[PDB]
Symmetry: C3
Subunit: 88 residues, 3 copies
């Protein structure tokens, strides 16, 4: 069994769908034409997601969890980086 | 154990809550009065959801997953149809 | 064996991350400074969440599920209360 998370933005629209399969999370993308594979590739058994626009710039936060460890991954216009999130 | 997904829109507001129970996903709806059962009824062990408005017209996408198969279901103003999503 | 759900709002932004661990759901909060522990503390094995603004006032709904029972929890400016949601 796979586990999914999804977010969207604009009126086109843009959609992003994160799938946790056998300990690896991957990303599928839609921008008003076809579905394609996105840059996001990280380890996880469980995923959630949220996003917001600042003007016309999209920002995404993905919460990947393995055992009891949860890692935030940030997209802000160029590539994916680790975020300051702590489970405290 | 049951597994849920939720989305909302407007300021009333409107809420939709999708519950995966014993391999069947069902929908519960709120539009500012009571909670009622919605049209959505499909197979799944796991669910996620997202939605957006074009003017006052709502569009919903639900991602129902059994085993390794994930099926997208589209609402766009009259009834539910299969979408172009592929894993 | 943790399970997460996330929501966000505004352009700062504000983020809320709900974690289901060993039958207890807890909340972590971000408002543009640090990550801190939030007021939300309720029983559950599974969680989902959604939120909306009326002007600058946030409203949050969290769906906490144990076995076949799902309980709605409402935030509307002034702590957390049970909501009218039923699963039938
Ligand atoms: C343009 O790059 C694509 O879209 C971004 C918004 C991200 O979802 C990224 O993972 C993907 O590769
Ligand atoms: C600016 O800091 C980055 O983005 C914030 C909105 C948070 O997601 C934080 O954990 C992350 O390090
Ligand atoms: C108008 O129809 C009701 O609201 C729609 C947005 C959908 O949730 C549908 O399944 C439900 O029965
Ligand atoms: C118009 O195409 C339908 O809606 C798009 C926004 C996507 O959900 C796509 O998978 C679906 O087939
Ligand atoms: C101001 O209070 C903080 O923000 C609210 C929106 C809630 O997330 C609450 O549980 C949290 O402690
Ligand atoms: C005022 O009523 C409360 O708020 C609504 C938006 C719903 O979440 C409902 O379950 C709850 O009873």
């Amino acid at each position: 069994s796979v586990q999914t998370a999804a977010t969207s933005w604009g009126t086109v629209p843009s959609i992003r769908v994160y799938t946790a399969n056998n300990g690896k999370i991957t990303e599928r993308c839609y921008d008003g034409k076809g579905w394609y594979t996105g840059a996001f590739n990280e380890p996880g058994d469980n995923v959630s997601v949220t996003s917001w626009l600042v003007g016309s710039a999209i920002h995404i936060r993905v919460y990947a969890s393995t055992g009891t460890t949860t890692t935030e991954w940030c997209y802000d216009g160029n590539g994916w980086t680790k975020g300051a999130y702590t489970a405290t």
